[PDB]
Amino acid sequence: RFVRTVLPFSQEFQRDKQPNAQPQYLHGSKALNLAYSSIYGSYRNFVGPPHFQVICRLLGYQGIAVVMEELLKVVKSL
């Protein structure tokens, strides 16, 4: 499993601002939103096999290949 570091080296990510909408475009209602947020909050403070399963399943061969090529470029640059 991976875990975040203590005293993090990078804080320059500047991620996109969260969009908002009515509850029926998310899980479906306020209670359902809260329930699912609580359910998935358990996956937030580590990276492990389940995350990799999801990543593979969503990226397919195309995304896996491109990501590996870009990681090779990153390591070459470093």
């Binding site: 996109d16 908002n20 909408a21 009515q22």
Partner: peptide, 28 residues
């Protein structure tokens, strides 16, 4: 470049549906 385009190229009446959508969106 894609994120820059998406940010700058944002979105841009006498339709009832539009009026109701604006009303409910403000209501949220």
């Amino acid at each position: 470049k894609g994120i820059q385009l998406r940010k700058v190229e944002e979105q841009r009446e006498n339709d009832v549906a539009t009026i109701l959508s604006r009303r409910i969106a403000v209501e949220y």
